[PDB]
Amino acid sequence: GAMEAEKEFITMLKENQVDSTWSFSRIISELGTRDPRYWMVDDDPLWKKEMFEKYLSNR
């Protein structure tokens, strides 16, 4: 579910210094290596990208 995974995913997004000036390419390229949290939660690229739209709108 999108509980533990989402929570950490939001935190890693701040810690990876992600903001509006990012593509979901930079996520796969930088967040896929900086810390394996992007892999801890299984890769749903549509949810990762949906929630990324949340991280850009709400953050």
- Domain limits, the chain: 1-59
Contact status, residue 44 vs residue 1, Cβ threshold 8 Å: no
Q: Retrieve residue 37's tokens.
A: 């949290």
Amino acid sitting at position 15: E
d(CA 8, CA 27): 14
**Distance of alpha carbon 57 from alpha carbon 50, whole angstroms:** 11
Amino acid in the structure at residue 55? Y
**DSSP-derived 3-state class of residue 44:** coil
DSSP structure string for 14-31? HHTT--SS--HHHIIIII
What does the block give as tokens for 11?
A: 């935190």
CATH class, range 1-59: mainly alpha
d(CA 17, CA 22): 10
